[PDB]
Amino acid sequence: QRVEQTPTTTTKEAGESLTINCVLRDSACALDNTYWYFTKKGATKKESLSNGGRYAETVNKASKSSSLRISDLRVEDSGTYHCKAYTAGIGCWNIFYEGGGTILTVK
Amino acid sequence: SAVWGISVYGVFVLGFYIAQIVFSEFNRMRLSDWISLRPDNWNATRVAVIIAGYREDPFMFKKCLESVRDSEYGNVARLICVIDGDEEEDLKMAEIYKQVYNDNVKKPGVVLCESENKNGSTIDSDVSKNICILQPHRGKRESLYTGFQLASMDPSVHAVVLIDSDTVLEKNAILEVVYPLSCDPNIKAVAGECKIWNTDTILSMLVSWRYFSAFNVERGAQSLWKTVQCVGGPLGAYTIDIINEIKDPWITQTFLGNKCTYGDDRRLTNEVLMRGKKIVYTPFAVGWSDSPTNVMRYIVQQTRWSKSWCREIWYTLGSAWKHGFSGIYLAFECMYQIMYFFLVMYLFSYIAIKADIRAQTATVLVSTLVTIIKSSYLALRAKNLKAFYFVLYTYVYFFCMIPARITAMFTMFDARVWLWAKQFLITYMWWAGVLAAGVYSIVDNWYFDWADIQYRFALVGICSYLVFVSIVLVIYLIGKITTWNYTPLQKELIEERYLH
Numbered sequence: 181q182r183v184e185q186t187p188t189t190t191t192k193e194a195g196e197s198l199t200i201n202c203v204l205r206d207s208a209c210a211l212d213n214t215y216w217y218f219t220k221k222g223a224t225k226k227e228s229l230s231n232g233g234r235y236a237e238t239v240n241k242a243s244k245s246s247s248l249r250i251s252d253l254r255v256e257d258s259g260t261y262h263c264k265a266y267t268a269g270i271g272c273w274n275i276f277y278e279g280g281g282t283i284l285t286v287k
Numbered sequence: 288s289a290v291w292g293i294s295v296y297g298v299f300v301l302g303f304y305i306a307q308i309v310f311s312e313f314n315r316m317r318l319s320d321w322i323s324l325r326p327d328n329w330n331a332t333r334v335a336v337i338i339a340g341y342r343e344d345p346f347m348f349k350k351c352l353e354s355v356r357d358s359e360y361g362n363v364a365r366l367i368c369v370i371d372g373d374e375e376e377d378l379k380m381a382e383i384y385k386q387v388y389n390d391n392v393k394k395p396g397v398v399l400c401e402s403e404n405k406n407g408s409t410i411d412s413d414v415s416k417n418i419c420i421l422q423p424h425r426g427k428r429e430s431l432y433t434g435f436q437l438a439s440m441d442p443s444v445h446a447v448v449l450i451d452s453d454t455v456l457e458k459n460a461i462l463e464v465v466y467p468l469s470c471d472p473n474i475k476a477v478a479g480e481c482k483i484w485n486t487d488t489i490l491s492m493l494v495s496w497r498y499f500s501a502f503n504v505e506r507g508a509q510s511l512w513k514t515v516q517c518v519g520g521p522l523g524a525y526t527i528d529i530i531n532e533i534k535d536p537w538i539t540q541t542f543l544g545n546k547c548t549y550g551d552d553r554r555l556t557n558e559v560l561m562r563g564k565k566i567v568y569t570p571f572a573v574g575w576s577d578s579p580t581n582v583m584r585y586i587v588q589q590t591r592w593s594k595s596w597c598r599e600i601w602y603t604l605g606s607a608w609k610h611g612f613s614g615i616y617l618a619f620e621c622m623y624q625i626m627y628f629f630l631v632m633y634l635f636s637y638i639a640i641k642a643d644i645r646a647q648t649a650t651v652l653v654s655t656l657v658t659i660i661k662s663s664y665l666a667l668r669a670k671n672l673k674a675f676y677f678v679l680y681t682y683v684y685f686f687c688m689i690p691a692r693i694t695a696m697f698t699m700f701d702a703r704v705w706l707w708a709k710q711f712l713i714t715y716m717w718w719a720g721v722l723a724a725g726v727y728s729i730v731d732n733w734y735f736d737w738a739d740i741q742y743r744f745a746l747v748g749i750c751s752y753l754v755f756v757s758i759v760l761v762i763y764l765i766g767k768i769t770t771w772n773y774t775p776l777q778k779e780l781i782e783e784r785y786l787h
């Protein structure tokens with residue numbers, strides 16, 4: 181059971197939008213919901229992201245997939261993005277699945 | 288008056304016990320149904336087990352680590368060993384851990400709890416290898432906290448099984464505690480059935496069946512209500528998340544403005560209950576732990592447990608309303624405990640004052656009937672005939688639990704003579720009081736009347752009770768002589784203790 185942040189690396193100009201998808205793979209358990217964490221370059225601390233502002237996260241339950249649409253990228257948005265998957269239901273453990281992470285460079 | 292009181296006592300106790308019985312059976316049925324749909328070779332959850340010990344017996348520690356390694360769970364991230372030692376004597380525990388697991392052991396000078404940086408990266412750098420910590424003797428919580436940090440350190444850790452140094456575990460026990468909550472996300476903690484294996488002494492034997500009952504009835508019942516008031520030290524599961532969420536609060540528990548350096552069990556569980564999370568208990572997970580065999584050590588242990596219970600009841604009630612509908616049973620249970628203690632004390636006071644032989648005969652008979660019913664249930668549940676030894680639990684309960692209760696209540700607020708007094712003077716005064724009541728009653732009723740039907744009934748009842756207790760003692764003695772009452776695990780434990 182693994183989670184794949186398909187676009188795991190990317191470099192893009194400021195003042196565009198970027199979409200990062202998070203898919204839970206090889207799981208018989210249905211995805212519950214997805215949490216997104218951000219680490220600033222150099223920094224190690226992880227900061228949680230919430231729906232609103234420039235952050236728009238879409239959650240798909242049938243495909244056990246989620247995606248974060250971060251729009252209007254500035255320079256300080258440059259960092260590693262991590263998705264944190266959840267499984268729930270009857271007999272389905274509440275698990276943290278951490279994806280490979282997506283390092284974004286904004287120039 | 289006396290007849291009404293005994294009647295209500297009997298009906299009340301039996302009704303609550305039957306309700307707890309059906310609740311626990313429903314809990315067991317739900318757990319079995321949940322397990323029935325478990326996929327085979329299920330290892331979805333990554334678990335980092337945590338050990339905490341101090342001055343443990345080297346042989347028992349070696350057996351505990353052997354059991355931990357022998358567990359069949361295939362998704363154990365690492366073993367975190369924490370020992371508040373930093374002392375030449377405690378190096379024996381480190382040597383024992385080295386002969387079983389990876390030789391590497393780290394001995395930080397500083398305690399993470401008192402550290403300005405509570406992240407374990409100061410003391411640890413690699414998460415793949417199993418790590419043992421030697422730290423200055425702080426006590427309990429702290430040690431656990433250390434482990435907690437080290438656990439959380441590894442992200443994979445989705446849960447943390449907390450095990451006492453002196454605990455024998457089962458290969459399955461792990462999955463058995465790290466799976467129940469799969470069924471219900473809310474479940475944030477799984478109490479694991481623990482069993483007293485040392486049963487040579489009658490006390491140990493009694494306590495063993497006591498444990499049995501407790502775990503498989505009350506715990507079970509509360510488990511059904513997804514609100515087990517307390518987790519299991521020896522065998523206890525905890526979602527890493529809720530842990531991280533309660534570790535610090537629990538690591539910083541001060542009662543009346545005083546870091547509670549007592550039973551941690553209860554406080555973190557009470558914090559989890561405050562969060563509104565559901566706690567379930569499973570009986571399929573078993574962990575063998577030893578029990579006190581000396582009456583004085585049992586007294587002090589039960590006194591400490593009573594102190595922790597009385598200290599945690601206020602917060603338990605204060606947080607019980609947060610469970611909405613649920614929790615009502617928890618409130619009923621604690622109210623039952625307090626009112627049951629008060630009723631027992633009042634009944635004994637009334638018996639001592641009145642000294643009516645018919646009354647004492649009636650209470651003895653009904654208490655024997657209650658213990659008979661309880662032991663019959665326990666034997667039917669365990670498919671084992673030694674559960675009938677529980678009928679003697681009335682003696683040990685009366686002579687130990689009550690003095691421990693009074694000691695805790697008196698010592699909650701406000702050379703060696705004093706300290707020794709604070710432990711056993713309550714118990715000695717209680718024993719003197721019961722003896723004085725007995726002799727006063729026996730002299731107040733120093734008469735014989737064979738023409739009185741009530742007197743005849745009382746005499747035949749007391750004689751029957753005496754012969755029953757005598758034959759139970761005799762069968763226990765012959766069982767001890769033939770070593771039949773020994774637990775199955777104790778036999779090979781003795782075998783490889785001798786072969787050492």
Ligand SMILES: [Mn+2]
Nearest residue numbers: 343344453577
């Ligand atoms: Mn021990």
